[PDB]
Amino acid sequence: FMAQILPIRFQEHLQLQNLGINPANIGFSTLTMESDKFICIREKVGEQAQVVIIDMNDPSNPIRRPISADSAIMNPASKVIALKAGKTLQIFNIEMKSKMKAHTMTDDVTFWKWISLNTVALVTDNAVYHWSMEGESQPVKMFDRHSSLAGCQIINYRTDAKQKWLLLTGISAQQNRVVGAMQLYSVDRKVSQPIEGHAASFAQFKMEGNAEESTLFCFAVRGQAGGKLHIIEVGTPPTGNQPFPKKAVDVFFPPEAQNDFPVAMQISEKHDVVFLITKYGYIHLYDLETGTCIYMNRISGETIFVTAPHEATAGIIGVNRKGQVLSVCVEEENIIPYITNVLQNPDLALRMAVRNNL
């Protein structure tokens, strides 16, 4: 019944192979998408190393520049790029065709990522630094890496809005299993907590009855105990707030997907919904407040290896290994009809409408 309406809208935005991108470079090590504004691909044509920048507001005319770097990450908001070659890092102002700042590390940077409009996070074998793109400041060590991540492939680093809660995520192969290892660091308490988790995000959420927002930490994992999603308040609640009750729910995998697991998460600020993407290309939607599973479906035939918030829709945008750039967001006119008549959850239908953010 009502099978024709979904609580989501799926969109295809681009096919990178139609823009002259070699499929061999559509992957984690060579393609970055730090926000929904740009995609950056490192390619080698002949023996000329090149960087291709796709402006998502003008994607038919990508810029191909012969530059040699081990990694390239566009700023989330500005026409600014960070480039790395060996231990040397440089940030460039593209519009002004000028170098902004540079720094030479002592230890190799194995993973890096913009965490804000002006700060890039650097991960070495044993520590995590934050580096502002402004002024003269060098990178600042934020914390030392926990031993539980030793030997992991680092796959993500992200923070809460106030950059007081920092999360490093790695994976490792244990026999034929992919095991997630996370390090949650409190800047104020100077304490680390190891967590078995595969994908995660932070969110700000205003509880009914509270005047101030709660800082939530959501992570998903598939371990020996199966698929689980947790939603937790981190830190001391703002003065006057009631604490957010911890939520824990199952993450479902069908019998033919015993080897699937979570790989990406983004949270809608507007709709208080968690988007979870699995290795096999499934998307799940969960209510942030309760963890209720709203929707699941396989939306990609190829693995989606990078995601970002999709600002205009408060959704999630991602690139899959074939070069499809795709997004999922809440369908604002159909989600409450779906919850009412397919999920048959009038509590959630009511709570959603009361939030009145559709």
CB of 325 to ligand HRS, least distance (A): 21
**Which of residues 83, 91, 121, 168 is near ligand HRS by CB under 6 A?**
83
Q: Cβ neighbours of residue 180 under 8 Å, at least 6 residues apart?
A: 169, 170, 171, 196, 197, 198, 199, 221, 261, 262
Closer by beta carbon to ligand HRS, 99 or else 246: 99
Closer by beta carbon to ligand HRS, 34 or else 289: 34
Phi, psi (rounded to 5 degrees) for 249: -140, 165
Query: Pattern of binders to ligand HRS over 63-82, x per CB under 6 A?
Result: --x-xxx-----------x-
CB of 127 to ligand HRS, least distance (A): 21
Following DSSP, what letter does each residue of 212-274 receive, concatenated? S-EEEEEEEEEETTEEEEEEEE-SPPPTTPPPPPPEEEE----GGGTT--EEEEEEETTTTEE
Closer by beta carbon to ligand HRS, 85 or else 350: 85
Distance of CA 190 to the CA centre of its chain: 24
Is residue 350 within the footprint of ligand HRS (CB under 6 A)?
A: no
Is residue 90 within the footprint of ligand HRS (CB under 6 A)?
A: yes
**Which of residues 6, 94, 187, 296 is near ligand HRS by CB under 6 A?**
94
d(CA 40, CA 241): 42
Residues 26-65 that bind ligand HRS (CB under 6 A): 65
Is residue 96 within the footprint of ligand HRS (CB under 6 A)?
A: no
Distances (CA, A) of 8 to 42, 284, 297, 298, 327: 33, 10, 10, 13, 10
Is residue 204 within the footprint of ligand HRS (CB under 6 A)?
A: no
Following DSSP, what letter does each residue of 110-163 receive, concatenated? -EEEE-SSSEEEEE-SSEEEEEESSSSPPPEEEEEPPGGGTTPEEEEEEE-TTS
Stretch of residues binding ligand HRS (CB under 6 A), selected from 88-96, 124-132, 151-159, 222-230: 88-96
Closer by beta carbon to ligand HRS, 133 or else 299: 133
d(CA 310, CA 317): 5
**Which of residues 85, 96, 191, 312 is near ligand HRS by CB under 6 A?**
85
Binding site for ligand HRS (CB under 6 A): 65, 67-69, 81, 83-85, 88, 90, 92, 94
